[PDB]
Amino acid sequence: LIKKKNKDIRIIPLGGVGEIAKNMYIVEVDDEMFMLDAGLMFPEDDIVIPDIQYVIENKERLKGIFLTHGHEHAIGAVSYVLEQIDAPVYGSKLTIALVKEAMKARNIKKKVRYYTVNHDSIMRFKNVNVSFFNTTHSIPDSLGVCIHTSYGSIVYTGEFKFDQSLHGHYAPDLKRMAEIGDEGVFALISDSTEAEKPGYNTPENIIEHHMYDAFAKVKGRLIVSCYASNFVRIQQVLNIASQLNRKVSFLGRSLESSFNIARKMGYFDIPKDLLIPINEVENYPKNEVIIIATGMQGEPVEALSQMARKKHKIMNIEEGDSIFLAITASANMEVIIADTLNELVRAGAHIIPNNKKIHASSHGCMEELKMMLNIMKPEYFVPVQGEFKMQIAHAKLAAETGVAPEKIFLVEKGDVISYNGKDMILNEKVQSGNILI
């Protein structure tokens, strides 16, 4: 609910537009400033982070940092932000955990005010109240942010999907979303990542079923390559390993921090004595182990090339091994997969083929996005989290749902959307850019 009569709204993207990552969206209501996410981008073509010079010059007015989910595209730059500025950090139980770990990992001694929020939390400020709602993503406890103004709600979806099989901390708040919609949404800021792809995602249970049928035929050792970010896909192989009386080992010699924190907080459903350390692998027959190679940048692929070319520090591929790629390939990574496949074949490994009829994504396709648009019914729309072609795609979806085209804004980094109370205008441009580290 609303506090006072507001005058000025400003919306400034410093990251996540005209590119696919580095989420950072500034929202101002009068004299108060809020930062929605603080992602990094893995330089394609270490890391890249947004230019926050605009924020620093107006540091006095930054009331909070709001973090939608635990991925590096949301919270990857937070440590670097907190070095230059002191503001309170708001996020879910899991998101705060992962941020704190990033701070511990960088040996940063700065004292930080962390506020754990949930879909029942309602954070109060001078000009506005902020609420939250659960979304569906590849990681549990993902939140949408709802900034309540006199003009209506400013909603930032974060990254989201709509899957009728995900039903835990992965489940969405369709009633809280419908209520936000009818109370009236002034502005919607939504994920455009798969806005070009017609229809829907393949449901996760369908993907799991096809993985099961594939893995059940494997007579030898099985190695699965995954993104560490994709908690669902990891949960899926744990389920399958258990039903096939196989045991699971990650690449060594300890367990991946994100996975291991979430595991210790009870986010994974793991039976007893299912994980064996990589040091205990040799003891078991080849057909009783599933090895999972996780990573972030695209190492998941690199690791298999190093396992094929003998040449892995820990463990190498043997003839009769089965390989499965439980990832979704960026066009930048299509060639290195084809090299790796060749080397896998030479080393005499069986390639479990991906079903081409399956579409796996953390992000909603056209119909999923239209779903959020139909629910929200925003007056103004700002498609983000995509390149220019993706933003356009999302805009056409919005126009179809009945948002006025005059009220849809396609913006670049540093663009400033202002609302006087009469007209919404793109009238300014501020300092923005890419800081490589």
Core vs surface per residue 354-388: b (16+ CB within 10 A) or e: beeeebbbbbbbbebbbbbbebbebbbbbbbbbee
Asked whether residue 361 is marked as a ligand-binding residue, the answer is yes
Beta strands (DSSP E) in 16-84 are 24-29, 32-36, 48-50, 62-67
Asked whether residue 362 is marked as a ligand-binding residue, the answer is yes
Q: Decide whether 159 or 163 has the Cβ nearer to Mn ion.
A: 159
CB of 218 to Mn ion, least distance (A): 30
- Contact range with Mn ion by CB under 5 A, out of 155-163, 325-333, 377-385, 397-405: 155-163
Q: Decide whether 80 or 231 has the Cβ nearer to Mn ion.
A: 231
- Contact range with Mn ion by CB under 5 A, out of 70-78, 324-332, 400-408, 417-425: 70-78
| Span 390-409, contacts to Mn ion by CB under 5 A | none
Asked whether residue 363 is marked as a ligand-binding residue, the answer is yes
**Interaction between residue 71 and Mn ion (CB under 5 A):** yes
Local structure of 252: helix, strand or coil: coil
CB of 39 to Mn ion, least distance (A): 9
CB of 24 to Mn ion, least distance (A): 14
CB of 328 to Mn ion, least distance (A): 12
Question: Do the Cβ atoms of 221 and 323 come closer than 8 Å?
Answer: no
CB of 137 to Mn ion, least distance (A): 6
Q: Kindly state the tokens that stand for 107.
A: 């040996």
| Span 156-185, contacts to Mn ion by CB under 5 A | 159
Q: Which of 151, 161, 181, 144 is nearest to 402 (CA)?
A: 181
How far apart CA 104 and CA 84 sit, in angstroms, is 17
Q: Which amino acid is at 93?
A: K
Q: Decide whether 224 or 232 has the Cβ nearer to Mn ion.
A: 232
Q: Decide whether 51 or 159 has the Cβ nearer to Mn ion.
A: 159
The maximal CA–CA distance of the chain, rounded, in angstroms, is 72
Asked whether residue 159 is marked as a ligand-binding residue, the answer is yes
CB of 73 to Mn ion, least distance (A): 5
DSSP for residue 408: B
Asked whether residue 394 is marked as a ligand-binding residue, the answer is no
Question: Do the Cβ atoms of 73 and 24 come closer than 8 Å?
Answer: no
The bridge status of strand 142-149 relative to strand 129-135 is antiparallel
Asked whether residue 360 is marked as a ligand-binding residue, the answer is yes
Q: Decide whether 159 or 204 has the Cβ nearer to Mn ion.
A: 159
Q: Decide whether 71 or 221 has the Cβ nearer to Mn ion.
A: 71
User: For the chain, how big is the Rg over CA atoms in Å?
Assistant: 22
Residue ranges of the annotated binding site for substrate are 359-363
Q: Interface residues with Mn ion (CB under 5 A)?
A: 71, 159
